[PDB]
Each structure stands twice: as C-alpha cells, then as structure tokens.
Design a protein around this ligand. Structure first.
Ligand SMILES: Cc1cccc(C)c1OCC(=O)N[C@@H](Cc1ccccc1)[C@H](O)CN1CC[C@@H](S(=O)(=O)c2ccncc2)C[C@H]1C(=O)NC(C)(C)C
Lengths: 99, 99
C-alpha cells in the first residue's frame, strides 16, 4: 500500500476488535484514540501538541488489526479531535515516508 | 529518500533562504514554522491542534528549498514547539507513506 498525501491518510483499524478511523501520522510519536473503552488498567499520562496538553490513559499491549496486519502496541485514550496512529505503530507495521 | 519511523523524520529546509529544522508530518494538513520573519504580507489564521487553538500568520507563495527540491507553498507562522511541514508541502515534493 501507498498513500499520496492529497487527502489525509486515514484507514480503519480495529482496537480490541472495535473499528476506529485513524490518521497515519509521522508527526505523532505515540498513538491516541477517542471513543473506545479499554478498561481500568492504565497509567495516567499527558500529551502535548499545538495549543496545549490533554490528559490521557495509557494502555499497553493492546491488540490492533490495521492494514491487514496484527500488532500489539501501546495506545492512549483521550479527547483527541481525530484518532492518531503515531510512529509507535507505524514502525511496528513497517511503514516508511518516501521521496 | 526513505525515512524509517524509528526516529522523528526531521530535516533541514531553507525558507526564503533561512535554515530551519522541520518535521515531515502526514497528519498536519498545513505547515507551521516558528522563529522566522516572513514579511508583511500576511492574513491572520486560527489553527487547531491537540491542545487547543493558536493564532498564526499565513504567508502564500513562500519559497522553500528541502530534500533537494524547491517548492513555493503556503507557510503559516506561529507559537509552535516544533516546525512542521504538513501535507501541502509533502504533496508538492512528491512524498508518500508506504507499506
Ligand atoms: C500523539 C502524540 C504523542 C506523543 C508525541 C506527540 C508529538 C504526539 O502528537 C501530538 C500532536 O499534536 N502531533 C502533531 C504535531 C505536533 C507535535 C509536537 C508539537 C506540536 C505539534 C500532529 O502530527 C499533527 N496534528 C494531528 C492531530 C490534529 S487534530 O486532531 O488535533 C486537529 C485537526 C483539526 N482541527 C483541530 C484539531 C492536529 C495536527 C496539528 O497539530 N496540525 C497543525 C500542526 C497544522 C496545527
């Protein structure tokens, strides 16, 4: 798969079996999804971006299926305008930015 | 050029002759740079990120030298922790995400 960047590179991922549309983001170090409930075993974290920080709940070894791949990775949940898959998952999937 | 995403994909660009370190960001729709004076010709824009909103100055037809290409693109200027090259510039360079 190859993504031109004319439109946002957004795909469907399944997090713990629930589908979420996510943005593939080389500018995000980690990943953060909204609207999913992952349970009580998390560590509190903060994440920053343009405009300030948000509180997040960090979850480890989450089961993800994306791009016909299956990984386990850390995901944060939080009030994010769009769901972001940062370089933590992208590296696990084997994606690169090419010119 | 191919960037694995183990490290942040940060490069040196020249904006109207001035060297800046920038992040190549597929999740940013637009581009925002701090610490450079572009000129008087701007419109003030509002820009939304993870934490909240920021006021910026938009510059059109700014000349950029990056990754061996020269482009002219729109660049905003603002209170940004990291200089960002988002999709407008990525598309113009012929960059893609690949799996
Ligand atoms: C999630 C994460 C974990 C650990 C480290 C980082 C850096 C993270 O990412 C946060 C972020 O905001 N990253 C953005 C780049 C960044 C990094 C560091 C500091 C500042 C900015 C992102 O790639 C690009 N994002 C993706 C999220 C969308 S959004 O969901 O928030 C949104 C979209 C439209 N309207 C409102 C909000 C906004 C957009 C961005 O800031 N874009 C501009 C740079 C053009 C402002």
């Amino acid at each position: 798969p190859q993504f031109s960047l004319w439109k946002r590179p957004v795909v469907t991922a399944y997090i713990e079996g629930q589908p979420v549309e996510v943005l593939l983001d080389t500018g995000a170090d980690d990943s953060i999804v909204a609207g999913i409930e992952l349970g009580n075993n998390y560590s509190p974290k903060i994440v920053g971006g343009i405009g300030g920080f948000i509180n997040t709940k960090e979850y480890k070894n989450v089961e993800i299926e994306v791009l016909n791949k299956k990984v386990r990775a850390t995901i944060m949940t939080g009030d994010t305008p769009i769901n972001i898959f940062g370089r933590n998952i992208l590296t696990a999937l084997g994606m690169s930015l090419n010119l």
